[PDB]
Symmetry: D2
Amino acid sequence: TRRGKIVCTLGPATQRDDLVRALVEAGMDVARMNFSHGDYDDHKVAYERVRVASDATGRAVGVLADLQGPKIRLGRFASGATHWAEGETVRITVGACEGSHDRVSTTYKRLAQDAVAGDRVLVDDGKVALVVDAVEGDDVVCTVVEGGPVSDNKGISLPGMNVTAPALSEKDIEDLTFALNLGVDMVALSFVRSPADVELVHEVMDRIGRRVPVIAKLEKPEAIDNLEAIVLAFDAVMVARGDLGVELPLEEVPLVQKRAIQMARENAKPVIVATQMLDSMIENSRPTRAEASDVANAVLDGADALMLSGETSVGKYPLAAVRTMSRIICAVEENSTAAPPLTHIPRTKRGVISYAARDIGERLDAKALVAFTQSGDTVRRLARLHTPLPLLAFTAWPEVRSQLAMTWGTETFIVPKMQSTDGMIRQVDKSLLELARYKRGDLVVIVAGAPPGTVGSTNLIHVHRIGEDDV
Amino acid sequence: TRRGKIVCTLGPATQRDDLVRALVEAGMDVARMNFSHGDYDDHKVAYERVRVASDATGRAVGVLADLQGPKIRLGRFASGATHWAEGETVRITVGACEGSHDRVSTTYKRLAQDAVAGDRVLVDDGKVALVVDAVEGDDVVCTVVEGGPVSDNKGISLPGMNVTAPALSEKDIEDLTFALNLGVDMVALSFVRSPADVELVHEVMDRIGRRVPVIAKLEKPEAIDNLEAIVLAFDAVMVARGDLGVELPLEEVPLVQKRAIQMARENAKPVIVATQMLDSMIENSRPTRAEASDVANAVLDGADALMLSGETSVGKYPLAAVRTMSRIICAVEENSTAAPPLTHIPRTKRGVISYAARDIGERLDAKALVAFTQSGDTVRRLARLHTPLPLLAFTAWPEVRSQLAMTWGTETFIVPKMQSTDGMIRQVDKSLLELARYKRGDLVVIVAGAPPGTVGSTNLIHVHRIGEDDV
Amino acid sequence: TRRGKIVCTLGPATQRDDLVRALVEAGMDVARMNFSHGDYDDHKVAYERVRVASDATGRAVGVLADLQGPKIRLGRFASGATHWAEGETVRITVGACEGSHDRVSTTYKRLAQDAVAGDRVLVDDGKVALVVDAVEGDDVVCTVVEGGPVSDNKGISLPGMNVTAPALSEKDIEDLTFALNLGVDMVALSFVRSPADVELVHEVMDRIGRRVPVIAKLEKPEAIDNLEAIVLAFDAVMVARGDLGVELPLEEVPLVQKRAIQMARENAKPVIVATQMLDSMIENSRPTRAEASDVANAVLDGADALMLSGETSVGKYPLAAVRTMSRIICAVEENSTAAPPLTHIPRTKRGVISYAARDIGERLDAKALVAFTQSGDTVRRLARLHTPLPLLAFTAWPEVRSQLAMTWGTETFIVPKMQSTDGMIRQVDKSLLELARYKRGDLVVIVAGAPPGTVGSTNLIHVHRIGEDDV
Amino acid sequence: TRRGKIVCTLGPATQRDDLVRALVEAGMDVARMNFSHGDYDDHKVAYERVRVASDATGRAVGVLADLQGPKIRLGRFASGATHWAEGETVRITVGACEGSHDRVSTTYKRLAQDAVAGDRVLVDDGKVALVVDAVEGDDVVCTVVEGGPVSDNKGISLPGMNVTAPALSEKDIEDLTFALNLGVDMVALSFVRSPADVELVHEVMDRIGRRVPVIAKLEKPEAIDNLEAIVLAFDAVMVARGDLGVELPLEEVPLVQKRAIQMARENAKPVIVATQMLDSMIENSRPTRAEASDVANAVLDGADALMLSGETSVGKYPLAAVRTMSRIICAVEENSTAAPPLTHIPRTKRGVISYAARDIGERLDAKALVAFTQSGDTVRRLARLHTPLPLLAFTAWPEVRSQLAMTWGTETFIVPKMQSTDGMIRQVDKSLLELARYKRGDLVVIVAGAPPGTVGSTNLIHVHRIGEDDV
Ligand SMILES: Nc1ncnc2c1ncn2[C@@H]1O[C@H](COP(=O)(O)O)[C@@H](O)[C@H]1O
Ligand SMILES: Nc1ncnc2c1ncn2[C@@H]1O[C@H](COP(=O)(O)O)[C@@H](O)[C@H]1O
Ligand SMILES: Nc1ncnc2c1ncn2[C@@H]1O[C@H](COP(=O)(O)O)[C@@H](O)[C@H]1O
Ligand SMILES: O=P(O)(O)OC[C@H]1O[C@H](O)[C@H](O)[C@@H](O)[C@@H]1O
Ligand SMILES: O=P(O)(O)OC[C@H]1O[C@H](O)[C@H](O)[C@@H](O)[C@@H]1O
Ligand SMILES: O=P(O)(O)OC[C@H]1O[C@H](O)[C@H](O)[C@@H](O)[C@@H]1O
Ligand SMILES: O=P(O)(O)OC[C@H]1O[C@H](O)[C@H](O)[C@@H](O)[C@@H]1O
Ligand SMILES: O=C([O-])C(=O)[O-]
Ligand SMILES: O=C([O-])C(=O)[O-]
Ligand SMILES: O=C([O-])C(=O)[O-]
Ligand SMILES: O=C([O-])C(=O)[O-]
Ligand SMILES: [K+]
Ligand SMILES: [Mg+2]
Ligand SMILES: [Mg+2]
Ligand SMILES: [Mg+2]
Ligand SMILES: [Mg+2]
C-alpha cells in the first residue's frame, strides 16, 4: 500500500453523513481543522466524526489544528461584497467603518503607518491586485491594477512590506485552548517568522498543561531566511504554498519547497506540502496534467505528506480528490521510493542505528522494519531515508500513533509498556501474527532500546524470525 | 537570461493586432499552428505575422505545423450542442446522422466493430465519461457515468482499445502539403504509435520535394511501448500530456514524461513538454502553485522546450502566460542549469567532441561555447548536456536557425558558407563583435569541422580569444 | 599497536632458549612449523616453547603446521654444498649415488622418464638455472645457464613440466597425524592444485577424529586458475611467493598476490603473504628499500598476515626481523587502516550484521567493536573490512583464539559458554574492565546471537556503555 | 610495449665494451652520470657512447648529470676495505691519518665539533651503524652497534644532527660546468632541502649561458617538509631512497614515495623512483620477490621512471637487470596503465586541453594521441594521466626529445619549426607515415597551438585521419 501520507482539510463538503468516514476509508491520514473558518460547534462535531471513523476502521488518523495567525484582512462592506475593476480608486483605511466599494476597513492598524506609495496589495491569494498611490492620514489610497470581486473579511497581503504583529493573536490563543482541550494531536501556526515563535505556543500549552507537536507553516520570507533554525525549534514544517506564493514571488516557490523538504528530512522532522496540488478538482472530477505532475514531484522531492485544502473542504469531489491523490502517489512509489540522499553521515545514536537497521533489512530481504519509539524520533530517523520495506512503529503512547500519521511510510502499533527488550519483541510477534499478512518464520529487523520506557535509549537491533526461538 | 525554450500555440486570442508581435517580444521561440482548428487563410495570416515579428525583432522563431492525426471525433448535433447528464443513455453510431441528445455519429467507422461492453469513452479529453453497455449493429449503446456538455465534433478517447487507422488522414496530407509550401520549419504528427509512421510523413515530403524535421507527439501507449525506436526514427518528440493522460491512466503520465525527456536527451533529439502547464491562466492573471511547480520541474527534468496551448491560443492572458512561464524557467536556471546526467558515455564523434568542448569552456571560464552546424546535430549534442555558458550555434543554412529555436540554451547566427575552418573562426569574431555582449580578448571555445560544408565532419576544437592572432 | 598479523617460521635460529619467547614478546602471532625440515622431536620441543610463551605472556599465538607436499628435491653432496657456475655440465639422476659437484640424486623418480632436452630446471627458487641437454639412461644431463651455490636437498622446479604426484605423500600423512595429535591449531598444504585437495586433508583429519582449519598454499598455476574455488573450499590461503615465482613468471607474481588477497577478503577467509619479504635480513641488520616497500604494500593490499621464513628460521637476526616488519606495518597503519573496498555488498546475515556493526561503531566513536564467535566467521566478516577501532572477538572455544591469531586486527577473549546474550554482554564488561584500556562508561558495540552457542546464529547488535544498565 | 621509463646509472660495469649499446638496445631511457665517482675523461667517454648508441638505434636517451651535493663520507683505508664487527671501537677523525680498521678520515670537518655522545652514525646507507661514545680532540670515538664491511669513501649519515653545508660545493660547481658544456640534457642535485636551492643551480647555468631541467633529489626530511614548494620550483624530483631511508626512519619511506609521486603528477613534473629496486641483482641473475613487488608497486603508484643504481653501474648483471625491470613494468601495464586519479580538476589551459584530448582519443578508439610541445609541458600534462594509447610528442627542439625520455609513456618526433597548425599537422602525417606501424585512414588526435613556436600557446585539438583532407 501507499507510503506517502495524505492530509485533508475538513469543511462544509465533509459535513454530511458518512463523508468523514469515507475519507478515512479512502486513505486520509491527517484531518486538518482550519480555524480561519467555522464555529467551535462545527469543529467539535467534525473532530468527533474523525475519532469515530479512525476507531471504527482501525486506521490511524491524526487531527491537526491550524491556527489563523496574524492574517491581515479587510473588514466588512455595506453590501457584503463588491467588484473592484481595473482602473478604480479604492481606499483601505485603518479607521473604523462599514466599508463600501470606495472605502473599506482593514484589521492591520499599522497599515497607514507602514505602507508607502508603490507598495503592492494582493487580495485573497492574488486575484485582485492594487498599487498604493498615497497615504492620506488614516487612508491608503490605491489603484486597482488587476480586477475582481472582493467580500467581507477577505485576506490581504503586502509583499516585501514588513508586518509587525504578535505570532499568536488573542483569537489564536483561544482557538489553541479550545483545540488542546478537545484532544487534537498536532497544532499548526500560520505565518511563522522566527524560531522564537514556538516559545509563545509552548507558553500557552504549559499554562493549559498539555503539549502537542507544533508545525511551523512556511509562508513568509523571514521564515525561509531562518529555515534551519525554525526546522530545529519546531517539530514539523508545512510548505504553505498559497500565501508563500504571494509573500514571495511565485516563481521562487518550487525551489523553496524542495529546500524545505530536504532540510526537514536532514533533521528528521515531518514535512507537509500544501495547497493547490489538485486545485481544479474543486469543480472537476479529474485534475490537470500540471496537478498530477505537482503531486508526483512532491513525492519525489521526499515529502512525508501532501495536503488537500479546498479540494476536500469546499469542493464537489472530496472523495475523488483523496483517491486521486492516492493513485498518483502509489504510481510513483511502485516505480521507486527513493528520496534525495542526505548530505551528511548520521551522528546521533538514533540516526546511526536507524540508518543501519535499514541497511540490514534491505540487504537480508527482511519482511519488515520495526522500530520502538516513545516520542517518535527513532522512527522519524528511519522514515526520512525511505525504503521499500514496511516500516512499523511500535509504541505504548497512543498519541504517538496519531502523531506518526504524518510521517512517511509508517504504520503504528500500540502495545503495553514493556519493562524488557525481550518483551518488546514478544509484543512484535503478537501484534504481527494477528495479521493475515505475517506468519511464523517471517524475518524482521527490530530496533529497540534499554533502559525501557526512556526517550532516546534506542540501542539495539535484532534480526528476528516471527515465532522462533532466537532472542 | 533564459535558456529553456517556449513554444506558443496561435489561435483566436493571438489574431488581435500585434499580439503575435508582443509574444515574440516577450520570448516566444516557436509558434505552433494547430491544424485541428482554423482555415488555411487564418494559418497563412498568422505565419506571416510570425515571420514579420521574427525578422523585425531579430529573434529566431520556428514555425511548427501540428497535424491532427487519426483523431476520433463525434459528429454533429442538430442543436450544435447538448447536455449529457449522469444516468442517461446515449448511442454513438458509425452510421451517418444529424445527431440529437440520444444519438450522434462518430468519425471512427470501426467503433461498433472494436468496442465491447465495459469499454470507457472519455469525451472532450474527459469532461464527460461514458461506459459502453452494448453494441446493436451500427450503434454503441452507452451510459453517461460522468456528466457534462458535449458539442459538434468534440474528440473522444477509448482507452486501451486497439485502434486501426492510418497515421496520416487525407486531411492531414493536404494540411501537410499546405504547410510545407507555406514555409513552416517543423512538422508535428499527432497520435504516433510506430517508428514507421515517420516514413509516411517523409513519403509526402518527398513527393512535394520539401523536408523539414518531424516531431512525434507522444500520446498513446503504443508510442511509449516503442519510445526508443520512435525517438530514433523521428527528429524530435513532444510529451503530449492532454491525450496521453486519457489514453494512459493520468497517474502514469509524470514518470512517462521524465523517461521520455531522458530518452530524447540520450539521443540528442529535442523534446517539448506540452499541455496544461499553466492551464488556469486561461481565466486568471496568475497560475496555481501546481502549475508553477509543473513548469519548474519540466526544466529540472531536462526539457528543451515547454509549450502553452489554450493559454495563448484562446485564453484571456496570452502575454502574461508567456512572461510567467519565462519568469519561472529563469528562476530555476539561476539556481542551476544542471540536467540529469546521461547514462552512457558519448560514442559518436560529434557527441564526444561536443562533450569535451564543454569540459574545456567551463574549466577555462570561457565566455561562450560556439559550434558550427549544418543540420544542427553537433549543437544538439552539446545542448542536451546543459551548461551555464552561452551556446551559440553558427550555420550557413537559415532554416537551421529556426529549427534550433526549439533546442535548449541555443542561439543561432547565420553566416556565409566558408571553405575553411580559419574562415569559420573569422566569421565568429565578426558576428560576435557586433554584439554589446562580446569584445576583443573574450575567450571562447569553437567547435568546427573539415571538410567544410559536410554534415558530421565536426573534428576540431579551438580555444580562441576574440580578435587575437591565435589561429 | 599493530593490527596486521605476523607469522614466523621456526628453525635452527629459534632453537636457543627462550628465543621463541622473545619472538612472542616482539610480536609473533603465528608460529610456522615447516615439515620440510626437522625431526618430530624438534617440532615437539618447539610447539611446547610456543605454548609456554603464549601462556606466560598472555598473548595469543597460533601454531601452523606446514606440510611439504609433492616437493621435488636434490639429494646430498659429498661436501654438503657446492658451486654450480655458468657453463658447467651437471647430471641429475634418479639413481642413488654419492653426490658431488658433477652428479647428484633427485627425489622425483619420473625425471629421467619425463624430461625432454630444453626443459628448464630452476634450483632453490631460481638462484641457479639449468637447461636439460640430454637424458642418458637414469641421468638428466644439464648445462648451468645461470650460476650459483647449491646445497643438500635444495628444491627444484621444472616449469611447464606437469608433475605426477599425490597431493599428500605418505610422509605428509604421517606429519599431519603427528601434528593433529600434538595439538596444532592450523594446517598448511603445499602445492595445492585443486579445491578437492582439501577433501583428502579432511579424510585424514576425520580418521583421527580431529579437524583444524586448512590453509591452501598458492604456488602453482593450477591453483591460480582455480583461485575462487580453492578460496571457498579451504579456510585460508597463503600467497607462497617462493615457489610461485618459479612456477609462474616472477613478473606475474605481484598481481597474482593482489588478486589472491582481494579474493580472500571477499569471502572472509584469512590470507598470508609469504616469502622474501625481508630476505636480506637473513645476513643484515637492516632490510633493503625494496623489502620495506614490499611489506608496506602487502599491508595496503589488505593482507591479514605477513610471513617471515628464513628471516627467523635460519638467519642471523630473527628478532630484529620481527621488530622491523612490525615497525613497517605500524608506520603504514598509523597513516590508515584502509584496504581495497570489496566489489560486492554483503548478503550473508553475518556479513550484513558485521558490516553494519562497523558503521555504527565508527559513526559513534565507539571504543571497540566486539563480536561473539564460535567458529570465527562473524569476526572474519568484520576483520576483512578493516577499521581503526579495536576489533575484539569473544568466544568460549580456546582454539578459536589461536585460529584468529592470523585474522587482521583481531584480539580474542575466552569466556564461559553462556546461555543468554545478556550473559554474553556481562562477560564483555567483566573481561574488559580488568584492563587498563577500558573503564566504566566506555562505549562499545557488541555483536552476538541467539540461539546461544550456535554457529551462525549471530543476530543482534547492541550499543553498550561498559558497566551501565542499558541492557 | 613499455610505457614506464627506465633510468640506468653508468659506472665500471658499463665501461666494458658495447655495454652502453646493449643497454640502449634493452630499453634504457636515461643514462645517469654519477659525479660522486669517476674522472672527467670517464664521463666524456660514457656521454659519447650514449650519444652514439642513441643515434645508432634511433632511440631517445636522455643524459642525466647527478651532482654529489654536500655528501659526507669516510676517507680511504690501507686495504681499500675492512670489516667493522659489532662490539669494536672505531675512531672517525677530521684530522689526517693512515686509515685502517681502527681509524679513518672523514670529509666533514665539523664532525668532531658537531658530534655529541649518543649520536648515531650510519654508513653505506645503514649496513654499518655506530654510536658515538666520545669526542677526543679530532676523533669521534664510536662503538659498532651493527656490523658489516666498510670500504674507501663510503657515505655516512648522522640522523637528527643538523649538518652545515652549501647546497652546491666547489666540486659540484665545477662538475655542473663540465656537464653543461659537455652537452647533458638534465641535471640532478643531491641533498636538496629548500626550493631556493634551484636558484643557485640556475645562477651557475646563467653565468655559463646554458640551462637544462633540474631534478631535485629527495633524501632529506627538510625536502619532504617542503615537498610542494620544491616540486613547484624544480622541474622534476627523484625519490632517492638510499639516503632518504637513513635520514628518515626506513619504515616511513614507502608512504613518502607515494605522496611524492602524487605531488609530481599533480603539478605535471616528472618523478623518478630510485635505489635498491632490484638490489640483489648486483650479485644474482634473478631478483627477490620483494624486489619484483617493489618495481610493480612503483608502476602502480604512477612513477614516470624507475632507476637502477649499482644494478647497472657496478654489478654483475647490468643487462639482465634492465630486461628484468622492463619485464615487470610490462607485466603490470598489460593488466592496466591506470594511475591514481588527480585530486583536482585541471585549471591551466594546457592541463584542460590535454585532459580533453585524452577523453577524445580513448572515446573514439584513436590509434594515437599526438601533442606538439616546445618545452614539454603540454605532453607532461597528458602523460601524468596515463592512457593505454600511444602518446607521441612532436617538437622542433631536439633537446626536448631527450628531456621527454623520462616522461611516462611518451615517444618524441623532431620536425621543423612550422609557421601554422595546418603545417604542424602535415608534419604529423609525414613523420608517422614513414613508420611501418602507421597507415592512411588511421584516426589520431592532435594537440597544437598558435601562435606557433610559443611556449604555452597550445589551444586546439584536431581529430585527424592520416593522409585525408580534413584540415
Ligand atoms: N512499548 C514500549 N514499552 C516500553 N518502552 C518503549 C516502548 N516503545 C518505545 N519504548 C522506549 O522508547 C525508546 C525509543 O524512544 P525515542 O528515542 O524517543 O524514539 C525505546 O528505546 C524504548 O526504550
Ligand atoms: N561464549 C559463548 N557462549 C555462547 N555462545 C557463543 C559464545 N561465543 C560465541 N557464541 C555463539 O557463536 C555465534 C557466532 O558464531 P559464528 O557463526 O561462528 O560467528 C553467536 O551468535 C553465539 O550464539
Ligand atoms: N614543430 C613546431 N613548429 C612550431 N611550433 C611548435 C612546434 N612544435 C611545438 N610547437 C609549439 O610548442 C607549443 C607547446 O609548447 P609547450 O606549452 O611548452 O608545450 C605549441 O603551442 C606550438 O605552438
Ligand atoms: O545526525 P542526525 O541523526 O542526522 O541528526 C541531525 C540533526 O537532527 C536532529 O533533529 C537534532 O535536533 C540535531 O541536533 C541533529 O544534528
Ligand atoms: O554517443 P552520442 O554522441 O551521445 O550518441 C548517442 C546516440 O545518439 C544519436 O542520436 C544516435 O541516434 C545514436 O546512434 C547514438 O548512439
Ligand atoms: O560477503 P558475504 O555476502 O557475507 O559473502 C561471503 C561469501 O564467502 C563466504 O565465506 C561463504 O563461503 C560464501 O557463501 C559467501 O558468499
Ligand atoms: O591544472 P593543471 O593543468 O593540472 O596544473 C596544475 C599545476 O601545474 C603546474 O605545475 C602549475 O605551476 C600550477 O600552477 C598548476 O596549478
Ligand atoms: O496556509 C496555507 O495552506 C497556505 O497559505 O497555502
Ligand atoms: O496533442 C496534444 O498536445 C495533447 O493531446 O496533449
Ligand atoms: O612455501 C613457501 O614459503 C614459498 O614458496 O615461498
Ligand atoms: O642519491 C640516491 O640516488 C640515493 O641516495 O638513493
Ligand atoms: K493537433
Ligand atoms: Mg496560509
Ligand atoms: Mg493531442
Ligand atoms: Mg613453497
Ligand atoms: Mg643519496
